[PDB]
């Protein structure tokens, strides 16, 4: 190309000036590059200074290369080909420069061009890079491998495709030749490259797997950390996808991995420790570790101590050895269950009472990690350990306090199942004290743990409500941002746990002002709305009428957030390159709070909905690609159907075909909420529902006959079928005997409430229309009627009329023989209410 003296002098001057210590000269050199950056000829100069101008010192050539790199990562679309191709050529021709800094800049450039640009726009990068691998000069081969490694790392899923034409079928078998390479760096590159293609089950590798595994074993003896690390991660990944090939060497592999897990180089050890995590998921786990489990447990427990650096940092963190070890112990406890306890109790004995806080802390962690797997076996020891943990909550080391909060929360079920005065009461008391700890990590540990306890305890925390609130509100004053969010979650769970008991003027008065205060201080773009909003959702449901003085602004903001989100997606959908897509959680949370408002306020939401476009917006949410949006909108639909149907009725003809298309059990909560909604609309429509039954019934019967479908979906499906039958017995009546079995099984287990009442009314009217539909499975109906404790009188006589009716057809003889099959409670219950 064409380097000129004047141009070169100006750019070299500018590069020197960009390296000036003066701050003002920096800002003006920066704006000068801002202007120059869009001119392709300038880029020609930048690479020219990098690769050709030996006269200039290295930081200048490299800075030129890096400025060029930013220009590529921000303007490469606008590069013409003549300059691009000049850069490409000059880079590959300098991949092995004897200067390490220049070599690194050329490398970053190359990879950046393949990333920002296009892999299929540089068709001959990979082939050339591979051949450079064979070169003589060491640095040249190192540089090419470095480039390939980076390319495989970010372009992973693109070489395993037909975008190009299988370069892997050439690259992978070539890498495996360099595991035997004399230099540690190159070995590392080779392994790290291959490793990118294990979980993908990449053909080129899978049909060379034998040679791969062989070369990995040949490397086991290598003491160079980077190669050990990569071999370790090879074996870990291989364990997940090509198990068969490894079984015959499993003993030596476990021996190796157990050795590496104890390596003093923490980075090697972490990759080794992943082996136990993924091994514990394979069904062959018990069999493989029979010779090694006794050693594995203490090694894991020992790796669960905080590292020395973390101890110092936390004195005033992502995946590490300690977290990996704790996760591995958790899963192994779930595999081995009570069989683990003889391995674990001697370590706990020596750890839980130790005088060195780091050791004690690890012990409490261990005790928590195994809680799920070993719960049954640990019960005998909990009357001692729980009081001991409660004492540890006031340990003088913050990190002991916080881990104790968590471990106790892991035994919350057992605590709640015991007499409240022995464990629950003192635990809750010290948990509340902790919540107001001066240490921020303790605060958050305590809040999480208290929330978990709240979830488990429920009604058992009604007598200690005022004291709980006393503490939670005070936290408003002391908590900083990060922990106020956890507090909102704790309040939310409290409101869900205690329901209407929260509705007292004093509680409302202490709770609402700081919630509204933070509501007014956060903007519509702040993600921190999610916990506040979800907290408000729970509070509103609990407060009911008590929420009246607060609803209007809350309602208004929520509808708008749904609106602006929906408007954002539309705008992003039109011009994706200029308008970023919105975060739909704002919409999910806004809908959920509106659901809570409608459930809480009931009828009293009418004025707000009358003045709103909530249903026009709701129509758009119900059709969204995202399941959770639909799930929230069908929930809101059901709540508004109950609260103010007059505003919903106009939309039914549109809404129903959409509800009808969301009866898909693959999406449990969407299918559920649609089903519930359709039952609620049924009750309000009455016989006007007749045209809509065919779009839903066929599916509902299939869903109620589907094996392994959650209890709650089946209960709602049954209720809805009952409700449809109540308003339109003729359309649904006919299929009576295809659903009566599971309908009865499911509904026999729910409490006597309005929904159950309504659904049984439906099944009674339907029996009158198609009684033969019940004859064959009358045992199920008898049981379902016997499930009623306190039925309203009209429902009872309906029952008695069908029962008395049935006995009069099969005769006192078939009746007696049939009712012999009644368990005692059943026979007696129906003579007690129905005199059958």
């Amino acid at each position: 190309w064409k380097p000129d003296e004047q141009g070169l002098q100006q750019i070299l001057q500018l590069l020197k000036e960009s390296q000036s210590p003066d701050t003002t000269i920096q800002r003006t050199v920066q704006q000068k590059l801002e202007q120059l950056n869009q001119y392709p000829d300038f880029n020609n100069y930048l690479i020219f200074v990098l690769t050709k101008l030996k006269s200039e010192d290295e930081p200048t050539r490299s800075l030129s290369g890096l400025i060029l790199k930013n220009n590529v990562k921000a303007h490469f679309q606008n590069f013409p080909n003549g300059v691009t191709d000049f850069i490409k050529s000059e880079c590959l021709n300098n991949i092995g420069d004897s200067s390490p800094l220049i070599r690194a800049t050329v490398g970053i450039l190359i990879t950046t061009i393949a990333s920002k640009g296009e892999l299929q726009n540089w068709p001959d990068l990979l082939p050339k890079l591979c051949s450079l691998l064979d070169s003589e000069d060491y640095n040249t081969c190192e540089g090419a491998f470095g480039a390939l490694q980076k390319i495989c790392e970010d372009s992973a899923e693109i070489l395993d495709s037909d975008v190009l034409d299988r370069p892997l079928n050439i690259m992978i078998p070539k890498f495996l030749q360099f595991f035997k390479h004399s230099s540690p760096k190159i070995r590392s590159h080779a392994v790290a490259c291959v490793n990118q293609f294990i979980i993908s089950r990449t053909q080129a590798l899978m049909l060379h797997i034998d040679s791969f595994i062989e070369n990995l074993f040949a490397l086991a003896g290598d003491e160079e950390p980077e190669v050990r690390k990569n071999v370790c991660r090879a074996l870990v990944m291989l364990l997940e996808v090509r198990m068969d090939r490894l079984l015959p060497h499993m003993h030596n592999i476990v021996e190796y991995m157990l050795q590496r897990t104890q390596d003093q180089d923490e980075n090697v050890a972490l990759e080794a420790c992943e082996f136990w995590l993924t091994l514990a998921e394979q069904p062959i786990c018990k069999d493989v570790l029979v010779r090694h489990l006794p050693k594995l447990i203490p090694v894991l427990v020992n790796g669960m101590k905080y590292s020395d650096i973390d101890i110092i940092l936390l004195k005033g963190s992502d995946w590490n050895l300690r977290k990996c070890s704790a996760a591995a112990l958790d899963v192994l406890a779930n595999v081995y269950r009570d069989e683990l306890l003889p391995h674990i109790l001697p370590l706990l004995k020596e750890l839980l009472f130790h005088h060195e806080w780091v050791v004690k802390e690890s012990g409490i962690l261990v005790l928590g990690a195994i809680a799920e797997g070993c719960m049954q076996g640990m019960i005998p020891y909990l009357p001692e350990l729980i009081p001991h943990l409660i004492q540890c909550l006031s340990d003088k080391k913050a990190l002991v306090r916080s881990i104790t909060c968590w471990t106790l929360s892991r035994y919350a079920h057992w605590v709640v199942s015991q007499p409240p005065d022995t464990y629950l009461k003192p635990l809750m008391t010290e948990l509340l004290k902790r919540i107001l700890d001066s240490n921020k990590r303790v605060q958050e540990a305590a809040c999480s743990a208290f929330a978990t306890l709240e979830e488990e305890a429920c009604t058992e925390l009604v007598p200690y409500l005022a004291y709980i609130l006393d503490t939670l509100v005070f936290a408003f004053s002391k908590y900083q941002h990060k922990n106020l969010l956890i507090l909102y979650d704790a309040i939310g769970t409290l409101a869900d746990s205690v329901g209407h008991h929260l509705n007292k003027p004093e509680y409302i008065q202490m709770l609402m002002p700081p919630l509204i205060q933070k509501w007014n201080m956060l903007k519509d773009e702040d993600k921190d709305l999610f916990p506040l909003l979800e907290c408000l959702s729970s509070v509103a449901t609990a407060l009911q009428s008590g929420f009246l003085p607060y609803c209007e602004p809350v309602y208004q903001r929520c509808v708008n957030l749904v609106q602006k989100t929906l408007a954002q997606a539309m705008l992003n959908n039109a011009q994706p390159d200029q308008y970023e897509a919105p975060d739909k959680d704002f919409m999910i949370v806004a809908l959920d709070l509106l659901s809570g408002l409608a459930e809480g306020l009931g009828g009293n939401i009418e004025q707000l909905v009358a003045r709103s476009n909530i249903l026009t917006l709701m129509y758009q949410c119900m059709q969204d690609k995202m399941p959770e949006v639909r799930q929230s909108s069908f929930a809101l639909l059901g709540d508004l159907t109950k609260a103010c149907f007059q505003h919903v009725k106009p939309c039914i003809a549109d809404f129903m075909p959409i509800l009808g298309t969301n009866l898909n059990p693959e999406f449990i909560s969407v299918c559920n909420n649609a089903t519930w909604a359709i039952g609620e609309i049924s009750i309000q429509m009455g016989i006007e529902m007749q045209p809509y039954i065919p779009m839903v019934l066929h599916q509902l019967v299939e869903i109620i006959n589907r094996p392994n479908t959650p209890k709650t979906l089946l209960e709602n499906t049954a209720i809805t079928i009952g409700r449809l039958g109540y308003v339109c017995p003729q359309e649904v009546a006919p299929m009576l005997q295809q659903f009566i079995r599971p309908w009865c099984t499911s509904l026999r287990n729910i409490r006597d409430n309005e929904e159950k009442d309504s659904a049984f009314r439906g099944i009674c009217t339907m029996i009158s229309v198609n009684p033969s539909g019940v004859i064959q499975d009358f045992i199920f109906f008898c049981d379902a009627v016997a499930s009623w404790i306190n039925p309203k009188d009209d429902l009872r006589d309906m029952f008695c009329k069908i029962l008395h009716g049935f006995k009069n057809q099969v005769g006192d003889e078939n009746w007696r023989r049939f009712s012999d099959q009644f368990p005692l409670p059943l026979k007696e219950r129906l003579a007690a209410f129905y005199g059958v």
């Binding site: 996760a327 958790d330 928590g368």
Partner: peptide, 20 residues
């Protein structure tokens, strides 16, 4: 029980800090 199925409990557990 019969009624809506919300994900508030699960969102609350998703923001609980992860020890490991």
């Amino acid at each position: 029980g019969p009624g809506k199925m919300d994900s508030r409990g699960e969102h609350r557990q998703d923001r609980r800090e992860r020890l490991y």
